[PDB]
Amino acid sequence: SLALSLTADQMVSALLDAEPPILYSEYDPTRPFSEASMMGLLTNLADRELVHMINWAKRVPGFVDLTLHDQVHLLECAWLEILMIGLVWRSMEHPGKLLFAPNLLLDRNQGKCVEGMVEIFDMLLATSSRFRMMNLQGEEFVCLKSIILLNSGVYTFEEKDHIHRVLDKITDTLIHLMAKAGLTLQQQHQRLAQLLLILSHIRHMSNKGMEHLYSMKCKNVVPLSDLLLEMLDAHR
């Protein structure tokens, strides 16, 4: 497996190169926001992001070595976590705001337009604030996002052993980055733990979010793409 034969610097480059672009929303500033119209905006955006995610996942070292069925499972489990970590990453330099898109930067007061959304909005803001405090680097971000993809669905499955070897290698890569950044040996393991523990809160935000998304569906608030419907149904 070439995934395992990559050096740390090689891991970083591949992951950086695989990064998806930032997309714009179809935000139309001619009309006031409603619950439905904002959910419509976020849904459409998320759907276009999903297509890019799928192609990004294929470029995560080791991922294409898994059966089609395991690739499906991992993405079904992690998709929202992945959308969310990307959102908090690009919102980092926007304190108090979430940059859903360059043309869709929202504060919590706008988040309140959608029933039950502001609570999760608040958790996302706090995570972005946390990443900002830690001075999260791009190289570290792409490692975490890949860890989420490989880890979040591994416990619900040989194939599992392969996944853990890749994960170990991303750990090596994270430490490598931190040491190269000049952190002491102790600072390295402490920062590793801090970043990984944040993944627990990202899981939490995903689980909570999924509940509301399902709710919005069964309340016909907004039309969902068939892809989105399948991803949602996978969590039920």
């Binding site: 297509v51 799928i54 294929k58 089609l68 690739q71 499906v72 993405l75 079904e76 068939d226 892809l227 399948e230 991803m231």
Partner: peptide
């Protein structure tokens, strides 16, 4: 089958 499944190929 699933749309995800097909997308992971195309």
């Amino acid at each position: 089958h699933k749309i995800l499944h097909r997308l992971l190929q195309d």
